[PDB]
Amino acid sequence: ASVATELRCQCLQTLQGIHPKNIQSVNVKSPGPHCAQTEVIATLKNGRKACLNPASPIVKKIIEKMLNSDKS
Amino acid sequence: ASVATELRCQCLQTLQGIHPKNIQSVNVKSPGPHCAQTEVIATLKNGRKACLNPASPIVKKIIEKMLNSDKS
């Protein structure tokens, strides 16, 4: 465990746009307390959560794609 | 209370992009059970939640703007 500026937050280690199938939702929150960092947790299908890098391009997709999800 | 196809979900009545200041985060989930509808809950600063219409244009902003939040 390294001394980073993010304790309150739950982010794993911001993945770079993983694959969904399990990923059923995501949460995005602004900074504030000592974590003073954004929030981008994708809730897994099993009811878990992961964080991804919205600053990342592929990951910025993760938001948009999670937002899409049409009938196909 | 009308008989709609969304009980499981918590959505208030999907607002059309309200103003933040309180809105500190949001959650987006896919359909599945009898709710069989998306999910777009903006968690309020007081720790509350609201739903908005991501299909809506202004509201699709609510996602992108909530995603932005820079130093300014």
UniProtKB/Swiss-Prot annotation, chains A, B:
Disulfide bonds join 9-35, 11-51. It comes from the Eukaryota. This is Growth-regulated alpha protein.
